[PDB]
Amino acid sequence: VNTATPGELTLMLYNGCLKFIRLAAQAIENDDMERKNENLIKAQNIIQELNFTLNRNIELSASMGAMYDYMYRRLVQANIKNDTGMLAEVEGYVTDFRDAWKQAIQSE
Amino acid sequence: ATPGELTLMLYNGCLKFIRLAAQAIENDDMERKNENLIKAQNIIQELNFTLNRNIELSASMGAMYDYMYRRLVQANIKNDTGMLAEVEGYVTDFRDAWKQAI
16 A cells, blocks of 8 residues: 555556467467467457557546646645545546546447 | 456546545544545556556557557467567567556
């Protein structure tokens, strides 16, 4: 909780993608078709996960980044003043981001 | 699998922790308030970092993701490990560059 490294999740997908590709190569060299297909399907899923997020993030642009900064800043300010009020406003913003993101998902 | 799930997951996680924090404050539970508020904060930085990088990589990285996707599909059909190695090289480069950004 105090040691979170911003950006590690994408890193994790990258590491996952590489393992699946490598496992896929081993599956082929050893006549294991089922394990080759499953791993490539998974390697493919990570790429599409990154692809989706990249594209949507480019559309949201820097103003969305300014939005995050604010929220982060507010949660810190709500944590120092025990202001459930500020948690309510931040919750209102995040709720719309999620619903909006949920849409962008189904929308394909 | 649904492309986009993981971010949806982060948003939902972030809402849970924000909500548990509101609960803690009312119960004068400073312990859990801090815990949950830091988690929600970590999620925001996680989303903020990714967004900032993705905008720097630009849409060109997007075309590269499509190609890689197609090469994998092709490599699966051809049982070609040379193609896998190719993609593996790109992903390793992108992962290192990201490991640096962090």
